Amino acid sequence: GILNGDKAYEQVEMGNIRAYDAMFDTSAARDFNFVGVRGASQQIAAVGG
Amino acid sequence: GILNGDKAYEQVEMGNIRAYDAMFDTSAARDFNFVGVRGASQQIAAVGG
């Protein structure tokens, strides 16, 4: 659904990682997905235009 | 002494950290220091001018 403001996931920065979604590890989560992060990151970008 | 090329310590990137030397933890090392990292980072910068 809609995004969150609980965390600064938009402030996470990493070296040499080119894709934003590749900064996050969903493997331990049985709840969330790989298209979930990519779909979220498209909603994150759309906030900024 | 002189710098190294064994590692990409110049490619380490972190969020919200303003000082380059503050990216590194010397606490576990009994060999190295806090002015050692700052002195190194001044030699790292001087390479680029």
SS3 B15: coil
Residues 6+ apart with CB under 8 A from B20: B41, B44
Give resolution, Å, one decimal.
Answer: 3.2
Contact (CB<8Å) A13/B13? yes
User: Tokens 């060999």 correspond to what residue?
Assistant: B31
How distant, in Å, are the alpha carbons of A14, A40, A42, B5 from that of A27?
18, 16, 20, 34
Q: Which two tokens stand for residue A18?
A: 């080119």
In 10 A of CB A2, how many CB atoms? 4
Contact (CB<8Å) B13/A15? yes
Q: For residues A16 and B11, is the Cβ–Cβ distance under 8 A?
A: yes
Query: What's the CA gap between B7 and B19, in Å, rounded?
Result: 19
User: Tokens 């402030």 correspond to what residue?
Assistant: A11
The DSSP string of chain A is -----SS-GGG---SS--SSGGG---TT-SS--HHHHHHHHHHHHHHH-
